[PDB]
Amino acid sequence: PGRKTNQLQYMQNVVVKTLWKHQFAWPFYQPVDAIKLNLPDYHKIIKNPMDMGTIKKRLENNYYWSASECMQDFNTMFTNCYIYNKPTDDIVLMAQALEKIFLQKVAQMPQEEVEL
Amino acid sequence: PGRKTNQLQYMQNVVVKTLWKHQFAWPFYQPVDAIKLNLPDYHKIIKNPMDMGTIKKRLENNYYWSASECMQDFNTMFTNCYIYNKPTDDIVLMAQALEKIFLQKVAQMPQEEVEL
């Protein structure tokens, strides 16, 4: 189902490693549990859930074939947060700070994807 | 019958001020809303709720007769968190870090209480 590539290794050992240690990453460590968190409209609004714990496990289990998938999973995780929450909610400001770092690291990723 | 004392001024202008600025203080700024947060046994276990917003308002309005009463409210706030949550929960470690700062500040409070 997946491969080792230079870009995926970069996503794991640079992007995820950096983001996981960030002070604002913790709300994204696990899938949103709409029952425990009392979010009765979450699944009505969000049809493609994603979180950084799932992304990290996918990298550790070689689930991804290309880093493009891992980048899209990050995009989905962040966009879901903006769609569901108000622009003034702290979680949205945290997501934005994380996404800026994500984009900074993506700018520096190896530009050609090579299987390893 | 409240008072204005040297120690109460210290509780307001040193203790509350310092703790409010800490990155872990935000769960304690307002009373726990057990309904919103989906904690249905909260008030069964926690019969004396307390939070730092209440403490701050009490100091701002000369509610306390002595700083000892304000220290009691801080202890109630921290202990409620230690009681309700499980021992390894993040919020317990946050409360422990805040209590450490609280105790360090209390150690530097003027030792005799004088009404101003």
Partner: peptide, 11 residues
């Protein structure tokens, strides 16, 4: 402004 955060923290 921190409610979802408090929920995540508690759960």
């Amino acid at each position: 402004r921190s409610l979802k955060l408090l929920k995540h923290l508690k759960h």
